[PDB]
Design a protein around this nucleic acid. Structure first.
Ligand SMILES: Nc1nc2c(ncn2[C@@H]2O[C@H](COP(=O)(O)OP(=O)(O)OP(=O)(O)O)[C@@H](O)[C@H]2O)c(=O)[nH]1
Ligand SMILES: [Mg+2]
Ligand SMILES: [Mg+2]
Ligand SMILES: [Mg+2]
Ligand SMILES: [Mg+2]
Ligand SMILES: [Mg+2]
Ligand SMILES: [Mg+2]
Ligand SMILES: [Mg+2]
Ligand SMILES: [Mg+2]
Ligand SMILES: [Mg+2]
Ligand SMILES: [Mg+2]
Ligand SMILES: [Mg+2]
Ligand SMILES: [Mg+2]
Ligand SMILES: [Mg+2]
Ligand SMILES: [Mg+2]
Ligand SMILES: [Mg+2]
Ligand SMILES: [Mg+2]
Ligand SMILES: [Mg+2]
Ligand SMILES: [Mg+2]
Lengths: 115, 68, 416
RNA sequence: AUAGGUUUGGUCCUAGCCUUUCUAUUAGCUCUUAGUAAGAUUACACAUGCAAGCAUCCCCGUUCCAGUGAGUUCACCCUCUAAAUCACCAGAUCAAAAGGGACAAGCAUCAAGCACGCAGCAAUGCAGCUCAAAACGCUUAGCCUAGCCACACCCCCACGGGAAACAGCAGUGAUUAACCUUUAGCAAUAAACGAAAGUUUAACUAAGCUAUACUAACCCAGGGUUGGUCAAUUUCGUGCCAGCCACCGCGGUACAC
RNA sequence: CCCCACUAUGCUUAGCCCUAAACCUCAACAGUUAAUCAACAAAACUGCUCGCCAGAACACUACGAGCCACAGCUUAAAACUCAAA
RNA sequence: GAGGAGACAAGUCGUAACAUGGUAAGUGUACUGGAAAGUGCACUUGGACGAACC
């Protein structure tokens, strides 16, 4: 389908079954469907803890670098995954959400102590 | 029925949904298919009748099941 | 295993709660019942039994069932009498007590419903309410004037005179009756009319009698079931609830229930489907017994042996009540000897390709009562030689039917 | 195919038909639970509700997602090179238009098409080009499925006209053997927007209905068949009638009704 | 069917017609007689090529097409039917 | 409307075919006839001529 405009994006395509999410890190044209045609599958991501309490993420770092060079954008979840991986800096929103969680738990603890 | 079989097979002329007029053999011991009644008709030729290449599906629309 | 869903046992005295009254305005043709209803609602032949939830100046709410007065709609009048709990008969003293007036009186007697006489057109000359009451004496409606219980109210629906007294009398009789019903639990009601809207599917205008109806309920009536999809009023505005004695139009009907059928709420869609299957099986057993007797007769005959002027008619109506009325008029045919009348197919809705095909197959005529036939249907009918006859009035359609019968021959059948 | 039944008075050969297997739709009869998957027959007509916003005004998007299969050798390879991304450029990626090649099925009782070619800068000249190795023509079909092509009410297009558009989600009438909710939230991923917190999204997610299927369970089993092919019948009733059969066949006082 | 008479016709000329059990029902070319070969018939095969065939009947048919053919010839289907032929 | 085919299905007139089917059968073609079919010309054996001489 001849798309006007658009641009490559490295993003998560949701596969899996109901109640069982699973993501394929695919470098795809942004206008293309979420789970549709993709230029290249750069990795995978299982968001459910496995028997060892792990969320397995596989990042084809070489091709990810090649596509970032070739001019592909990064969706926010992919940016946060890379930030956790240390391939990127931690996302400003990850940091701010961590601080928000710290403040929220602090309020909860303070109220529990008071009551 | 064609020889050697001998009987009086019950049949009905019906105008199918496709606009065609066909002859459907009515199975079962006894029926009450009167004129203007709506029936469902499936394939399967009655072997002893030449040209009667359909059968009324019992229990559907106005063709009640065979009384025991 | 019997899976039928039956009406719940009569409500407990503690569970009982006051409810509105249900009033049917019966009477013979053109005695101003429609005018009286319009005046009460603050807003030339009736052909539909219409339910309206009116609010009186006192703040009370009353459900009025305006019924047709024509002789043809005896079924409609009987259904209205059965469903209602008060019959505000309307009689024009100038015209006097008539055949349909007496019919309504008998229906009220059967239903065991208090009757209130409203003398209509009392403004006009020659109006003799005393004579009206006298004549009613013969038909057992003993007005309070002649030492009785029936309240007679002189009114002039056109001029709106004494209607306040009529409403006051109705409210007083309602309070005396002390009508109450359980507002909670599975809903119970009766279908007042059923039809097919090209937008809203199969709809049924019913009157609730118990419990409260709400979107998402599962109802069963006759061989039909529904998941209540849209509850609407006379003006179509959606209503979130339908308390007892509330007229409500319910959408979401998988099949078009017969008029007057009982509607009962069941637990779930699978339970409703089980109930419908069981009822269809019961009907199948009954028809099977009939067919078994006929077949046994035929088979005995066969074993012992072994030892034209016909009018085919398709009927299409706007509502099931209208279709039933036309069917009764047809069944009153008695001149089969000179010409036979055959009813190929009856239904509710605009003339359809299936109706046209039946007409073509049986050389029939389509009679559409208050229904349309799109240009596509008209073109197909012209192509196939079918004749469509769209009538908006029952007696006009009956006249046309008689004319066709004579053309086939005048026809000896008198509708009466 | 590991094949079987069937031509005949009988054998052999050829041969069609049917059986056995596996799926899918519909129908009859019947049905307990849980998880998942899939789900109008119709390019016929649509009530109603929603489905595209974002954002310090401009811009950007609403050309995407979603849908249907009417039409149908526009999909794949190469050449060239637009638009878009790479904060600017860089060449890199992506991929249009254009040009070259490849590209469904049947009908030859569709065998001729009738300008379908070339040269010249131009003027103009030559009379050529396709075709029995299937041209031209008719009918049918969405395809080669991480998805792709095509259509977007019809007039191929859409200035213009017909007319007032659900082939977006839910739903409806008609139609067919064929028939899912007129649910909830953007919490996750995707998209749009913004510098951003964030907002929006009938995409999607999580639910609703359906034995259509797979898995698991069930302490309440129905359906079909019982002459042979083909697992499997006791006694009655009927008596070439009623009836039964996928093929061979049965029923004239029955392991076939 | 047997007997008699006689005509078109069989003959010559100039055109048409283009069908046969036109059959040796056995295609052309090259080659072998070795391990045979359903039956019968005129033994069985190998290589290569062209034409043709794919249940029976409808059917040397209808339509379409071509033809000096006008009750014709060539090509030639389908629908219904059967479990055989 | 009429024809053609098929099937169903008992009749009517003959006995054309299967035996040398009582005139051997049939192909093409022509004329003729209720009807199969008859005859004319050529062709085939998918018939025979009894297989030493007599
Ligand atoms: N003079 C007078 N006329 C009245 C009065 N009330 C009603 N009418 C008229 O009397 C007639 C009553 O007929 P409707 O009630 O409309 O109809 P109907 O009784 O169903 O009769 P059908 O529909 O023909 O069966 C109408 O013309 C009214 O307007 C009244 O009080 N006085
Ligand atoms: Mg009235
Ligand atoms: Mg089923
Ligand atoms: Mg198509
Ligand atoms: Mg042809
Ligand atoms: Mg549309
Ligand atoms: Mg268009
Ligand atoms: Mg929709
Ligand atoms: Mg519908
Ligand atoms: Mg289905
Ligand atoms: Mg016996
Ligand atoms: Mg020869
Ligand atoms: Mg010939
Ligand atoms: Mg011919
Ligand atoms: Mg011809
Ligand atoms: Mg003979
Ligand atoms: Mg002979
Ligand atoms: Mg001869
Ligand atoms: Mg002769």
């Amino acid at each position: 389908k001849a798309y006007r405009g658009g641009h490559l994006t490295i993003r998560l395509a949701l596969g899996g079954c109901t109640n069982r999410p699973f993501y394929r890190i695919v470098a795809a044209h942004n206008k293309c469907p979420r789970d549709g045609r993709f230029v290249e599958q750069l990795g995978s991501y299982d968001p459910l803890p496995n028997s060892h309490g792990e969320k397995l993420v596989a990042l084809n770092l070489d091709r990810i670098r090649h596509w970032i060079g070739c001019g592909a954008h990064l969706s926010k979840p992919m940016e946060k995954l890379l930030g956790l991986a240390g391939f990127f800096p931690l996302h400003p929103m990850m940091i701010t959400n961590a601080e928000r969680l710290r403040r929220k738990r602090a309020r909860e603890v303070l109220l529990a102590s008071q009551k | 029925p064609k020889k050697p079989n001998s009987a009086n097979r019950k049949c009905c002329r019906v105008r199918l949904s496709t606009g065609r007029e066909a002859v459907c053999f009515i199975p079962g011991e006894g029926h009450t298919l009167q004129e203007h009644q709506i029936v469902l008709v499936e394939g399967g030729r009655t072997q002893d009748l030449p040209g009667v290449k359909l059968t009324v599906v019992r229990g559907k629309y106005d063709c009640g099941h065979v009384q025991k | 295993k019997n899976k039928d869903a039956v009406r719940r046992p009569q409500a407990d005295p503690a569970l009982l709660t006051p409810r509105s009254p249900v009033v049917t305005i019966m009477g013979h043709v053109d005695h101003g019942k429609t005018t009286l209803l319009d005046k009460f609602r603050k807003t030339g032949i009736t052909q539909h039994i219409g339910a309206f939830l009116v609010s009186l100046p006192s703040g009370e709410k009353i459900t009025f069932l305006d019924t047709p007065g024509h002789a043809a709609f005896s079924a409609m009048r009987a259904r209205g009498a059965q469903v209602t709990d008060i019959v505000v008969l309307v009689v024009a003293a100038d015209d006097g007590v008539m055949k349909q007036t007496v019919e309504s009186i008998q229906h009220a007697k059967d239903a065991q419903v208090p009757i209130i006489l409203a003398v209509n057109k009392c403004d006009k000359a020659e109006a003799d309410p005393e004579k009206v009451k006298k004549e009613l004496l013969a038909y057992d409606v003993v007005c309070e004037d002649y030492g009785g219980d029936v309240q007679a109210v002189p009114v002039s629906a056109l001029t709106g005179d004494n209607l306040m007294a009529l409403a006051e009398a109705t409210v007083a009789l309602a309070e005396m009756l002390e009508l109450k019903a359980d507002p909670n639990g599975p809903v119970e009601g009766t279908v007042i009319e059923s039809f097919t809207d090209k937008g809203r599917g199969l709809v049924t205008t019913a009157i609730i009698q118990r419990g409260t109806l709400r979107k998402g309920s599962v109802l069963v009536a006759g061989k039909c079931w529904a998941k209540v999809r849209l509850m609407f009023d006379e003006n179509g505005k959606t209503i979130d609830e339908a308390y007892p004695s509330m007229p409500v139009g319910i959408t979401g009907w998988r099949d078009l229930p017969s008029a007057g059928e009982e509607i009962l709420e069941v637990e779930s869609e699978p339970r409703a489907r089980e109930v419908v299957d069981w009822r269809k099986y019961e009907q199948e057993q009954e028809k099977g017994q009939e067919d078994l007797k006929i077949i046994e007769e035929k088979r005995k005959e066969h074993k012992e042996a072994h030892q034209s002027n016909v009018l085919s008619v398709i009927i299409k109506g706007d509502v099931d009540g209208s279709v039933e009325a036309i069917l009764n008029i047809i069944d009153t045919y008695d001149a089969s000897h000179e010409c036979e009348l055959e009813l190929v197919h009856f239904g509710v809705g605009d003339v359809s390709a299936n109706d046209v095909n039946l007409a073509e197959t049986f050389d029939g005529v389509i009679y559409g009562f208050n229904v349309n036939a799109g240009n596509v249907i008209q073109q197909s009918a012209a192509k196939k030689g079918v004749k469509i006859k769209l009538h908006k009035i029952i007696y006009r359609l009956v006249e046309d039917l008689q004319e066709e019968l004579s053309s086939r021959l005048k026809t000896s059948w008198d509708p009466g």
